[PDB]
Design an enzyme around this catalytic site. Sequence first.
Site, PDB file in Angstrom:
ATOM      1  N   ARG A  62       0.684  -1.203   0.267  1.00 14.15           N
ATOM      2  CA  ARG A  62      -0.172   0.081   0.112  1.00 14.15           C
ATOM      3  C   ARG A  62       0.729   1.324   0.110  1.00 14.15           C
ATOM      4  O   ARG A  62       0.387   2.406  -0.306  1.00 14.15           O
ATOM      5  CB  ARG A  62      -0.730   0.051   0.940  1.00 14.15           C
ATOM      6  CG  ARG A  62      -0.129   0.071   2.504  1.00 14.15           C
ATOM      7  CD  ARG A  62      -1.247   0.285   4.029  1.00 14.15           C
ATOM      8  NE  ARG A  62       0.090   1.066   4.704  1.00 14.15           N
ATOM      9  CZ  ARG A  62       0.722   0.242   5.463  1.00 14.15           C
ATOM     10  NH1 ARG A  62       0.709  -1.071   6.106  1.00 14.15           N
ATOM     11  NH2 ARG A  62       1.136   0.771   6.555  1.00 14.15           N
ATOM     12  N   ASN A  63       2.369   0.817   0.218  1.00 14.78           N
ATOM     13  CA  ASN A  63       3.107   2.315   0.376  1.00 14.78           C
ATOM     14  C   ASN A  63       3.868   2.561  -0.671  1.00 14.78           C
ATOM     15  O   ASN A  63       4.981   2.509  -1.145  1.00 14.78           O
ATOM     16  CB  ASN A  63       3.996   1.739   1.624  1.00 14.78           C
ATOM     17  CG  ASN A  63       3.197   3.021   2.826  1.00 14.78           C
ATOM     18  OD1 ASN A  63       2.975   3.418   3.904  1.00 14.78           O
ATOM     19  ND2 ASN A  63       1.545   3.385   2.511  1.00 14.78           N
TER      20      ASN A  63
HETATM   21  N1  LIG Z   1       1.667  10.122  -6.286  1.00 16.46           N
HETATM   22  C1  LIG Z   1       0.743   9.351  -5.981  1.00 16.46           C
HETATM   23  N2  LIG Z   1       0.341   9.288  -7.143  1.00 16.46           N
HETATM   24  C2  LIG Z   1      -0.741   8.163  -7.300  1.00 16.46           C
HETATM   25  N3  LIG Z   1      -1.451   7.749  -6.142  1.00 16.46           N
HETATM   26  C3  LIG Z   1      -0.646   8.831  -4.925  1.00 16.46           C
HETATM   27  C4  LIG Z   1      -0.109   9.234  -4.809  1.00 16.46           C
HETATM   28  N4  LIG Z   1       0.605   9.860  -3.607  1.00 16.46           N
HETATM   29  C5  LIG Z   1      -0.974   8.873  -2.650  1.00 16.46           C
HETATM   30  N5  LIG Z   1      -1.286   8.494  -3.434  1.00 16.46           N
HETATM   31  C6  LIG Z   1      -2.817   7.695  -3.659  1.00 16.46           C
HETATM   32  O1  LIG Z   1      -2.683   7.879  -1.916  1.00 16.46           O
HETATM   33  C7  LIG Z   1      -3.054   7.002  -1.280  1.00 16.46           C
HETATM   34  C8  LIG Z   1      -2.387   7.109   0.252  1.00 16.46           C
HETATM   35  O2  LIG Z   1      -0.652   7.737   0.156  1.00 16.46           O
HETATM   36  P1  LIG Z   1      -0.178   7.802   0.979  1.00 16.46           P
HETATM   37  O3  LIG Z   1       0.495   6.089   2.169  1.00 16.46           O
HETATM   38  O4  LIG Z   1       1.085   9.206   0.902  1.00 16.46           O
HETATM   39  O5  LIG Z   1      -1.104   8.352   1.997  1.00 16.46           O
HETATM   40  P2  LIG Z   1      -0.726   9.119   3.897  1.00 16.46           P
HETATM   41  O6  LIG Z   1       0.632   9.526   4.341  1.00 16.46           O
HETATM   42  O7  LIG Z   1      -1.663  10.962   3.468  1.00 16.46           O
HETATM   43  C9  LIG Z   1      -2.129   8.200   4.991  1.00 16.46           C
HETATM   44  P3  LIG Z   1      -1.427   6.845   5.482  1.00 16.46           P
HETATM   45  O8  LIG Z   1      -0.668   6.665   5.952  1.00 16.46           O
HETATM   46  O9  LIG Z   1      -2.773   6.130   6.142  1.00 16.46           O
HETATM   47  O10 LIG Z   1      -1.256   5.729   4.249  1.00 16.46           O
HETATM   48  C10 LIG Z   1      -1.913   6.273  -1.970  1.00 16.46           C
HETATM   49  O11 LIG Z   1      -2.054   4.571  -1.839  1.00 16.46           O
HETATM   50  C11 LIG Z   1      -2.433   6.279  -3.254  1.00 16.46           C
HETATM   51  O12 LIG Z   1      -3.476   5.039  -3.592  1.00 16.46           O
HETATM   52 MG   LIG Z   2       0.997   5.038   3.120  1.00 13.41          MG
END
Ligand SMILES: Nc1ncnc2c1ncn2[C@@H]1O[C@H](COP(=O)(O)OP(=O)(O)CP(=O)(O)O)[C@@H](O)[C@H]1O
Ligand SMILES: [Mg+2]
Lengths: 282, 280
Positions: free
Chosen positions: B144-145
């Site tokens: 997921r990351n």
């Molecule tokens: N650069 C990017 N391009 C496309 N989709 C992105 C993206 N960054 C984030 N996403 C989408 O958003 C989701 C969450 O991103 P991220 O993992 O950075 O979240 P977050 O840190 O805001 C919250 P959490 O820690 O709960 O995941 C990713 O799994 C993806 O679906």
């Molecule tokens: Mg995340």
Amino acid sequence: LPEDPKWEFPRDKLTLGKPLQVVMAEAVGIDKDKPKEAVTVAVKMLKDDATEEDLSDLVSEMEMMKMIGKHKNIINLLGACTQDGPLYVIVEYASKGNLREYLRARRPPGEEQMTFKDLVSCTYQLARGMEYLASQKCIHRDLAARNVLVTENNVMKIADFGLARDINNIDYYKKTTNGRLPVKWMAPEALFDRVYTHQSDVWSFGVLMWEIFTLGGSPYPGIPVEELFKLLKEGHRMDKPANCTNELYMMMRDCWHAVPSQRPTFKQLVEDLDRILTLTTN
Amino acid sequence: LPEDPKWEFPRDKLTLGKPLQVVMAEAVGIDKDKPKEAVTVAVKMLKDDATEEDLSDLVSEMEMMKMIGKHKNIINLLGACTQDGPLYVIVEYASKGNLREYLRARRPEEQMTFKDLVSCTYQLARGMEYLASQKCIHRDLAARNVLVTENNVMKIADFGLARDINNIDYYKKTTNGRLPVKWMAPEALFDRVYTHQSDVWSFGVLMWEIFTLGGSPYPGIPVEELFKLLKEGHRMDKPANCTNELYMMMRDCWHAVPSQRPTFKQLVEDLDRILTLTTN
Ligand SMILES: Nc1ncnc2c1ncn2[C@@H]1O[C@H](COP(=O)(O)OP(=O)(O)CP(=O)(O)O)[C@@H](O)[C@H]1O
Ligand SMILES: [Mg+2]
Ligand SMILES: Nc1ncnc2c1ncn2[C@@H]1O[C@H](COP(=O)(O)OP(=O)(O)CP(=O)(O)O)[C@@H](O)[C@H]1O
Ligand SMILES: [Mg+2]
Ligand SMILES: [Mg+2]
Ligand SMILES: [Mg+2]
């Protein structure tokens, strides 16, 4: 987790249902007096990607709910499955959902619209809930419309004790204290002095009041969280919600006094709202 | 918040879009050589109900990405709006979503070949090798990351928990309390330490997710009882689409003794070999 018979509930009597991590579920005999009676309830449990802190929060939330005691305007803890399996915290089901969603869905078409009295009544019940909580040495720290549940009979219920603490379980002056509290509902002393008292909850109650009279509006609209505290220190305060009396607005303003002791107590809020509510009825 | 001209991007040149808190966006001249070209990017910012910790995490994330450096298998940091306004962390837009969704989408939306899976794993090992060489620990490795670009390029993302190997409160009870338990190395909790070898443990879980095409780790086991089982030696079973060799690699990543797990450098060498064979 230690065994606590008075609250333990048989897993085999609980049928987990759809999501509301919280989910709806049926609990057979959860109500001692109706041993065979199935009851619709809510169940909070960890997510599959939960962290250690998520668990400690869930455990903490459950214990606070045990020590709080029952009250009309506080969601009720019904039981818990803490042995030989995932932790399940069983709580009373509120059919109308959270207060924020509740209010938004009842906004004028511009569902059943909220009368001015309904709004005052809502605020009053919540003030009573907080008045009780405070008498129990409990600080919620996370008061907000999204954390209020409404029952089928429109009874307001304070919920999500995921961040609540005993008045003596706060680490005064530590940089890490109050770091997980939503900024737009947070009292200045919480971050500036790293303390937390019932009066800190009163400040939160004010924003809740604003949320209520704006029918579920978001506080400090257009103002980014990273710029808020500068503005608060500069005396900025949200504006009067439309169709809100100057009197109720002054009440909000009183909750937003910078000096904690200049803010009313939940008891004072309750008496004032009681008057306004009664006078509106008549 | 300090001014970092090098990375500062003008707000007027950024047009926020739909949700992906992360939103899509169009940035003009984000690519210096193309001052008038609008680039589709992704912007991370605070939610209306964000907490103080949410802010420092966002700041930490931005700062880590600065320190990391550029690498083909690491989501690229393009710029940031840090002055007079809300904090915006602008990163490269990965058109195909996160690896977990990607994999589950193409479950027997065009089925993955064994080689694709191995390739996917290889790329991620490479990214983690570099990441490790930069003295950085991710701490939140998981499908997921991981983001996947239009060209199916794998990219490690979400540095919201990442840290400098030297910035860890050794032995403190509050250390590592925000890492998803099912991807967490045992020492991370029992001893409150975190090293590169802790990341390889997580890499092992990531591998299992990949070859199961986005399967959920430790199926049927609640987080509440996972650490007792892990302490007893419990480990996930081999994925069907996996070769015994690759599963042995996973097992290696999950060795109880941290120093006994392979290094990311060794993982890349082994994966490269396997990939070269599979493709030949
Ligand atoms: N650069 C990017 N391009 C496309 N989709 C992105 C993206 N960054 C984030 N996403 C989408 O958003 C989701 C969450 O991103 P991220 O993992 O950075 O979240 P977050 O840190 O805001 C919250 P959490 O820690 O709960 O995941 C990713 O799994 C993806 O679906
Ligand atoms: Mg995340
Ligand atoms: N007893 C209950 N009856 C009905 N709905 C409930 C409920 N408990 C929770 N919900 C629903 O789930 C929402 C989230 O609940 P809660 O506030 O307890 O979440 P949470 O503690 O899991 C996470 P967060 O801190 O992000 O809110 C509520 O706003 C409401 O819509
Ligand atoms: Mg909540
Ligand atoms: Mg909560
Ligand atoms: Mg994150």
